[PDB]
Design a protein around this ligand. Structure first.
Ligand SMILES: Nc1ncnc2c1ncn2[C@@H]1O[C@H](COP(=O)(O)OP(=O)(O)OP(=O)(O)O)[C@@H](O)[C@H]1O
Ligand SMILES: [K+]
Ligand SMILES: [K+]
Ligand SMILES: [K+]
Ligand SMILES: [K+]
Ligand SMILES: [K+]
Ligand SMILES: [K+]
Ligand SMILES: [K+]
Ligand SMILES: [K+]
Ligand SMILES: [K+]
Ligand SMILES: [Mg+2]
Ligand SMILES: [Mg+2]
Ligand SMILES: [Mg+2]
Ligand SMILES: [Mg+2]
Ligand SMILES: [Mg+2]
Ligand SMILES: [Mg+2]
Ligand SMILES: [Mg+2]
Ligand SMILES: [Mg+2]
Ligand SMILES: [Mg+2]
Ligand SMILES: [Mg+2]
Ligand SMILES: [Mg+2]
Ligand SMILES: [Mg+2]
Lengths: 126, 98, 79, 124, 55, 402, 119, 105
RNA sequence: AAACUCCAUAUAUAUAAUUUUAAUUAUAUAUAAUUUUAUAUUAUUUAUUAAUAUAAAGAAAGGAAUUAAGACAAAUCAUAAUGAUCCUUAUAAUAUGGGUAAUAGACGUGCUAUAAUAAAAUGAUAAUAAAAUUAUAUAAAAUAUAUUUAAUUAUAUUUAAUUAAUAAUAUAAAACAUUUUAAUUUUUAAUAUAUUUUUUUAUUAUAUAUUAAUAUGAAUUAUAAUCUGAAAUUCGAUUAUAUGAAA
């Protein structure tokens, strides 16, 4: 949590100067992973050691901001990121119903090639 | 409920003789006092055993009948109590009192 | 039990030579499904150590070659 | 300084308290009334089938002899019927102290203001 | 449930067309699942690490 | 044998119902139920009359699991919001088609028993179907009738016809002269081998004679159609048709019976189902304008969208599977203009009256009488009963030894 | 006692249950179809049946593969396994499990029942 | 009429309770490609919904079974405090503090 | 060493524009107890005391980790690693098939069961959880078949949403209510009867065998179909009909 909280505080300061209304950091439920091992290398499966890993999570939300300013925020905080912190960003773009100019699998191709090869065409002959 | 508590207080033995493995020689049969929680257990088990000799398929019915007969005076577990008290009266001198 | 809709477990075998010459077919494909064509032909089926000679009848179609070449010896105790 | 601010009834005369038992939680709204109770919007006999669970909910009101003097709107989640019924019991006891703080000693003596700590323990 | 099956089949077919989905009213096994499964080769083949390490 | 003549061998629910445990109850003198003088009995516990008890026992108005064995005879609290309110609508409403609802144990069956008591007093003929499950569970014989194109159930019909005869005043039945001539096969073991058939001529024989016809099982379906037709054509006597536990009918569209193709038989293909739904839907119209149809649901049955939709409480959802929504029953109920009467829960004053009667009946434990203030008891029992549920009130008083 | 095709039944026994209990080859589903075909109501008991109805049950039972005929089909399928020399046939001959069960322990029921002339 | 046909053809992608039509695609390798794909489907669905020359599917009622299944997996706290239970006359009344009243002048 | 700690618990502050909603929550920080006080009694090293009770205050009742020494030259050279010694066309390496699943007896640990304080059905405005999982995926709803009105269960078809406090695995289950339940003539049926009517009573029929295995139990086995896989023969899982052992 320590680097996570410190970095979250830095993001809020960056956003303020950029003119971005920000909320958070909202703490999300911590995920706990668990692994149980047998301490001995060969036998003695009666003494088992416990290990765990906690994923700490924080949500910072941005409001009423233009896309260009939002990209500046992400670029700056990426340049000055801390060790052991990961970041996922969901962007929401409101658009018009009808746009201008808009916004085949490998297996299927091989099947067509295989069905044309002689080992298959020799049977499809009707 | 008052009938149940009266029946439990009349059927449960006040004391019970217990064998204590004291010394390499033969154990001693010394009368011991019983508390109310221990008294109720002895009397309840007697009631349940008597109840399970009745004809009803439902335990509640057999228990109800057994409790009604005990509240009306008739029960075969009063003999058990008299036999536990006879043994204790015989071993009255075996008590330690210190 | 292989699903019937998938078809038989067809394996590469030399059946043409065994039908024009009568030679036995030596194979390790114990999973192979005995097809109705095999009827009458002679097979030598591996059991892990030796090749068991077996001729296919009409009551063997659908079964698999491995079913007719036992791989273990009958158990016995030193009574 | 201290971290305790006097509890008082809200704008609608309601005393709000939270209670916990095992994995269950309960948030009750106690107001002066005539003994009407609602659990998660449902009648008490509907939500709690066991009469012993209903008797547990009533016990704090029975200690202060105020069973017909309050309306309870209880909301509960988590655990099972026993945890929820006793979590509501604990929350009603904590909400009744605002109406008369002189009865806290009697509620403590009855044992309804003590949070039950017992929970499922992973075998060690 | 009272909606005629013919009407519900017309909706299913048209809906499938709009959403580029495979409409197989009969239920014949088509193998479409095989064509849609993801390729796990790249992940499987990197189990032991990147082979182009400095030695 | 292990079972003696007086041994209690059944389970608890059947023992309490059948073991005649009311014999030891103390006789109390209570006012009698009379709707014409309800002003004197409103909000008071009353017993039924001797003429009402005889009829209601033959109709099946009193059921097991109603703690009836606590009292010398079954008693009822004449309520203003349930008993008086319902009986006034029954006397005033022009349609007179009702379905009684409410939460499990709220007192829907007792309300129906009070409507039966009113009908007995008001010189009406009561046709009650207490337990519809008996003709839907597949535990009695069934036969197909070609002339009716329905599956008739002779064993059940024999019991039902006797209940209609023994529960209703013979004088009322004798007043209804027959409108048509009827001929049936004779099953009377005295002259069956002498008289092939028994004829009932019009204007000479009455509906009382029709209810005493002993016929062969295969002709008993035609006897039930005649009885209903004769009672629906006459305009002299009002007919009160009642069905308790009607929720079972609404939620069991297909009986346990199977036809010759191992297909379960639709309930409306049974004469009992068809007859029941013909009276409810209005297909079978009664000439007398005071005839009523009172249905009651029970909490022992599963619930689904059938009844709520029929009553207009929820919108129709067409994609609900048939097992949870039967559109044919909804159509029949709405064609008959059946109206809902929800039985309200007891108020605290009604709880006080019931607990005051229980004290005089000597059914209250000593922990609720000694060392407890009367006001505290009423408040506690009103809280522990869910704020009015009569069944939870009785259980808190006589079936809570904790 | 009601006798259908030699089998004896206690009067109280439910017909659909009794048929699937005493007759080899008839189970719960098959018994229900027989009763549905003969117009017997779901929970009818044996003592209720008349002689015409007892004969109808025997007729429908005699048009099915039950008792010896059904048992012979199993004995002939097992014999075919031994005739072709399949691994399964040998297991039946050796009184050993034929469906992959371990034999280091247990395997007691296969030892008592697995045989070419299976009951 | 076109709104009804649109909702019928969306099937599980429409939630009547919230009125939201949501469809996602990750079939292509680039987000821009996937965005166009969803846009193109939206135009196709709108064109079919606005072409009521052959069929309008007005007889066909909206199917919500998918939404019902989702609702059963989320806990619904849909109960509010009864209004006739509120006792506004029992709320604490602000007391008069001369100091605060005098410190404001 | 103990403690000081960390967890749990209680409380306070901060964070969430309360639609990622569980605010009855999430998780950062801080506080709290190794509880405290008064009185009587019994002992004492009798005093500024312990054991006890009584009264008062309090949410306060549980845990983890916490290191030093020695032994069994206890297990492991088969998690990997080292010395010595041995193999080097083989004691190294690859492929196909087989084996590790054999079966007299014996032993350990489990599962299921041997019926009525207990098993089976049914319960849709859907009684009531927690902790986890889903990019080497979790799979909704719907439709089709088994299969019957439908539900249920299984599989196929199709692949909605979600790579997640959002969607899915997943409507927890027991509980509770109703019905049913062999042994059990304690039943069922036919008549009559009732102020027990889902029921009572009467008279007839309802079996014989039987220390015993039923409508308990589900081993074994026949046939058909399905799932995963390139492949289910030795040797996998599931379903249907039939089989129905021991106990
Ligand atoms: N008016 C009343 N006076 C006295 N007792 C009553 C009254 N109403 C109900 N009760 C009692 O309440 C209990 C339930 O009554 P009743 O059987 O009529 O309820 P119900 O709603 O029909 O039940 P279910 O949902 O099971 O069909 C019984 O013990 C009954 O005697
Ligand atoms: K059988
Ligand atoms: K084996
Ligand atoms: K063993
Ligand atoms: K909220
Ligand atoms: K192997
Ligand atoms: K059992
Ligand atoms: K759950
Ligand atoms: K058996
Ligand atoms: K296999
Ligand atoms: Mg009722
Ligand atoms: Mg998608
Ligand atoms: Mg589902
Ligand atoms: Mg060793
Ligand atoms: Mg091994
Ligand atoms: Mg729920
Ligand atoms: Mg599905
Ligand atoms: Mg979810
Ligand atoms: Mg449920
Ligand atoms: Mg269950
Ligand atoms: Mg069984
Ligand atoms: Mg035996």
């Amino acid at each position: 949590n320590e680097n996570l909280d410190f970095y979250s505080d830095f993001i809020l300061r960056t956003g303020y100067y950029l003119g971005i209304p920000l909320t958070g950091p909202k703490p999300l439920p911590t995920r706990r992973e668990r692994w149980t091992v047998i301490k001995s290398p060969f036998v003695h499966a009666k003494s088992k050691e416990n290990f765990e890993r906690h994923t700490h999570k924080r949500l910072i939300r941005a409001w009423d901001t233009n896309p260009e300013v939002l990209q500046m925020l992400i670029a700056y905080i990426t340049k000055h990121s801390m060790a052991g912190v990961g970041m996922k960003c969901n962007f929401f773009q409101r658009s018009e119903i009808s746009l201008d100019l808009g916004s085949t699998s490998a297996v299927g191709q091989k099947v067509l090639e295989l069905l044309d090869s002689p080992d298959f065409k020799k049977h499809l002959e009707k | 409920i008052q009938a149940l508590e009266k029946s439990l207080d009349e059927l449960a033995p006040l004391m019970m003789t217990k064998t204590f493995n004291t010394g390499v020689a033969k154990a001693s049969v010394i009368p011991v006092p019983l508390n109310k929680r221990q008294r109720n257990r002895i009397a309840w088990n007697w009631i349940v055993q008597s109840a399970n000799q009745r004809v009803s398929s439902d335990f509640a019915v057999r228990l109800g009948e057994e409790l009604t007969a005990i509240a009306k005076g008739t029960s075969s577990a009063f003999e058990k109590r008299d036999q536990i008290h006879k043994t204790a009266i015989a071993h009255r001198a075996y008590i330690q009192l210190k | 039990s292989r699903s019937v809709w998938k078809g038989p477990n067809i394996v590469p075998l030399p059946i043409r030579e065994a039908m024009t010459k009568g030679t036995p077919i030596r194979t390790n494909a114990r999973a192979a499904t005995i097809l109705p064509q095999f009827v009458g032909l002679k097979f030598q089926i591996h059991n892990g150590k030796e090749y068991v000679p077996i001729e296919i009848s009409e009551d063997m179609v659908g079964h698999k070659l491995g079913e007719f070449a036992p791989t273990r010896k009958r158990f016995s105790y030193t009574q | 300084s201290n971290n305790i601010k006097i509890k008082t009834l809200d704008e609608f005369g309601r005393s709000i308290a939270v209670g916990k038992r095992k994995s269950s939680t309960a948030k009750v709204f106690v107001v002066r009334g005539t003994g009407e109770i609602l659990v998660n919007g449902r009648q008490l006999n509907d939500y709690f089938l066991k009469m012993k669970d209903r008797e547990s909910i009533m016990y704090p009101l029975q200690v202060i002899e105020s069973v017909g003097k309050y309306n309870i709107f209880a909301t509960t989640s988590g655990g099972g019927p026993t945890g929820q019924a006793e979590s509501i019991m604990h929350a009603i006891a904590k909400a009744l102290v605002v109406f008369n703080p002189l009865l806290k000693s009697r509620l403590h003596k009855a044992g309804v203001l003590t949070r039950d700590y017992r929970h499922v323990e992973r075998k060690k | 449930m009272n909606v005629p099956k013919a009407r519900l089949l017309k909706v299913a077919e048209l809906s499938a067309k709009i959403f580029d989905q495979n409409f197989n009213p009969s239920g014949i096994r088509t193998g479409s699942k095989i064509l849609n499964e993801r390729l796990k080769g790249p992940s499987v083949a990197s189990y032991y690490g990147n082979p182009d390490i400095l030695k | 044998k292990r079972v003696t003549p007086g041994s209690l061998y059944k389970n608890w629910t059947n023992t309490t119902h059948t073991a005649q445990l009311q014999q030891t109850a103390v006789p109390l003198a209570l006012p009698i139920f009379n709707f014409d003088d309800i002003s004197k009995t409103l909000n008071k516990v009353v017993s039924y009359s001797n003429k009402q008890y005889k009829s209601l026992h033959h109709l099946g108005s009193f059921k097991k699991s109603q703690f009836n064995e606590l009292f010398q005879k079954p008693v009822c609290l004449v309520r203003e919001d349930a008993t008086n309110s319902f009986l006034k609508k029954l006397v005033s409403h022009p349609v007179k088609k009702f379905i009684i609802t409410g939460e499990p144990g709220v007192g829907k069956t007792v309300l129906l028993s009070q409507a039966h008591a009113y009908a007995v007093d008001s010189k009406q003929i009561i046709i009650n179907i207490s337990y519809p499950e008996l003709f839907l569970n597949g535990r009695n014989d069934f036969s197909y009738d070609d002339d009716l194109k329905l599956f008739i159930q002779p064993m059940y019909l024999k019991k039902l016809i006797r209940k209609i005869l023994k529960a209703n005043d013979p004088a009322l039945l004798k007043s209804i002269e027959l409108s048509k001539d009827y001929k049936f096969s004779n099953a009377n073991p005295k002259n069956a081998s002498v008289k092939p058939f028994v004829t009932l001529n019009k204007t000479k024989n009455t509906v009382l004679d029709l209810l005493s016809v002993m016929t062969h099982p295969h002709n008993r379906g035609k006897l039930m159609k005649a009885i209903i037709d004769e009672l629906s054509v006459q305009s002299k006597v009002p007919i009160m048709f009642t069905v308790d536990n009607f929720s079972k009918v609404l939620t069991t569209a297909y009986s346990a019976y199977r036809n010759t193709e191992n297909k379960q038989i639709y309930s409306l293909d049974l004469q009992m189902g068809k007859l029941m739904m013909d009276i409810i839907s209005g297909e079978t119209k009664f000439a007398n304008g005071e005839s009523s149809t009172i249905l009651a649901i029970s909490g022992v049955d599963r619930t689904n969208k059938t009844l709520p939709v029929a009553l207009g409480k929820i919108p129709v959802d067409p994609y609900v599977t048939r097992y949870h929504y039967e559109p044919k029953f909804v159509e029949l109920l709405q064609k008959g203009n059946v109206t809902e009467f929800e039985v309200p829960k007891l108020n605290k004053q009604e709880v006080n009256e019931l607990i005051d009667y229980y004290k005089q009946s000597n059914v209250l434990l000593d922990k609720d009488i000694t060392g407890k203030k009367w006001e505290n008891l009423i408040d506690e029992k009103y809280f522990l009963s869910g704020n009015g549920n009569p069944r939870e009130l009785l259980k808190s008083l006589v079936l809570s030894h904790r | 006692v009601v006798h259908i095709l030699g089998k004896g039944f206690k009067g109280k026994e439910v017909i659909k249950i009794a048929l699937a209990s005493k007759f080899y080859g008839i189970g719960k589903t098959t018994a229900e179809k027989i009763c549905s075909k003969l117009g017997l109501y779901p929970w009818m008991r044996m003592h209720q049946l008349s002689e015409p109805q007892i004969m109808s049950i025997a007729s429908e039972l005699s048009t099915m593969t039950i008792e010896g005929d059904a048992r012979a089909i199993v004995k002939d399928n097992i014999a075919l396994k031994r005739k072709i020399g399949s691994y399964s046939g040998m297991r039946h001959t050796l009184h050993l499990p034929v469906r992959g069960q371990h034999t280091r322990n247990n395997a007691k029921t296969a030892r008592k029942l697995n045989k070419i002339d299976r009951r | 009429k076109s709104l009804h046909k649109f909702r019928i053809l969306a099937r599980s992608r429409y939630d009547h309770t919230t009125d939201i039509f949501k469809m996602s695609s990750d079939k292509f390798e680039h987000a821009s490609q996937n965005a166009r794909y969803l846009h193109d489907i939206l135009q196709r669905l709108l064109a079919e919904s606005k072409d009521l020359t052959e069929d309008d599917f007005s007889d066909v009622p909206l199917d919500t079974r998918h939404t019902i299944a989702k609702s059963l997996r989320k806990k619904k706290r849909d109960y509010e405090f009864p209004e006739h239970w509120k006792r506004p006359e029992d709320a604490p009344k602000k007391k008069f503090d001369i100091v605060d009243q005098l410190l404001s002048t």
